[PDB]
Amino acid sequence: HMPEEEKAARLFIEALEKGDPELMRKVISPDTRMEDNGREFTGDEVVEYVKEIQKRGEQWHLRRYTKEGNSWRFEVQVDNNGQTEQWEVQIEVRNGRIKRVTITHV
């Protein structure tokens, strides 16, 4: 069994893994904000982000995660075109909804 907060963050990650904009649309809220290496996305832009993942054939795979303070920190492997990267995805779930997502890969 999975608590509601952990479940929501997991579904966000699943939508990335599946490259599935439809799932992502069901997870986020109009005020969800996401940052990926400087680029900012809010609301349906996050869905657009997933569309682009699906388009470019970018592959996400969840490796491991922990709860750090009041955010979930996911270690995700991201592949494309023969290159493999380790990215960090930090999710704050506030009041059962995805509030802020921070993607880091440097």
Q: Resolution to 1 decimal, in Å? A: 2.0
Q: What are the backbone angles phi and psi of residue 104, rounded to the nearest 5°? A: -125, 130
Q: What type of residue sits at position 94?
A: R
Query: How many of the other CB atoms lie within 10 Å of CB of 9?
Result: 24
Specify the experimental method.
X-ray
Q: Which two tokens stand for residue 78?
A: 């991201």
| List of residues 6+ apart from 74 with CB closer than 8 A | 9, 13, 62, 64, 65, 88, 89, 90, 91
